[PDB]
RNA sequence: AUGGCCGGCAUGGUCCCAGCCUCCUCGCUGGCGCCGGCUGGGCAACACCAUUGCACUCCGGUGGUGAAUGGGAC
């Protein structure tokens, strides 16, 4: 099943050995160029490890980010990027 | 002494220097002889195992101390 365009991109296949704080910092280092980021959500729990949500202010940023960085080698692993299924809370609280 | 508790045995002492050791006051006002048994805390770090997982509620499991020695002064 495919996903529809979204403010938020969902990244998985991330290196699970990286600490939350550093992972957010690094993700920002490479994704900020695509547009203003509202937040980056990372959790190292059993269910949510290896994954991240990057919440852009504009959908065009998310879209550009998804196209350009698909398969990007990151901590020695190719990034897999999709649109999030649903809107992040940060986004609902505006639009 | 050890995260806490006990037993067998060995071993002259107090300082100074260097090297090493550790999940549980990484520190020079901790520790670094032999062997056996009992037991608590915690995944914070570290390691291993499992996990490819769509969140906006912090939240998988297991492991270790079964550790580390030389030199000088009195
Ligand atoms: Sr110790
Ligand atoms: Sr853990």
Residue numbers in the entry: 4 to 98
The study reports:
After several cycles of automated rebuilding using tools described before, evaluation of their output, and sporadic manual rebuilding, alternated with rounds of refinement in PHENIX, the structure was significantly improved. All geometry and ribose pucker outliers were corrected, including 10 ribose puckers that were misfit as either C3′-endo or O4′-endo and now corrected to C2′-endo. The reverse GU wobble base pair positions the O6 atom on G25 to interact with the active site metal ion in the C75U-inhibited structure, but no metal ion is bound in the cleaved structure. The final model of the two upstream nucleotides, although not fit or refined with alternate conformations, shows electron density accounting for perhaps 80% of full occupancy, so the C75U mutation indeed succeeded in producing an uncleaved structure. The backbone suite between U -1 and G1 is now fit very satisfactorily, but the U -1 O2′ is still 9Å from the metal, and the position and orientation of the scissile bond is even less appropriate for catalysis than in 1VC7. The rebuilt structure was refined with two TLS groups, one for the RNA chain and one for the protein chain, and has R = 19.80% and Rfree = 25.13%, an improvement of 4.11 and 1.27%, respectively.
The catalytic activity of the HDV ribozyme is essential for viral replication and viral particle assembly inside the host cells. In this study, we have used these new techniques to correct and improve the cleaved and the cis-acting C75U-inhibited structures of the HDV ribozyme, which were originally solved over a decade ago.
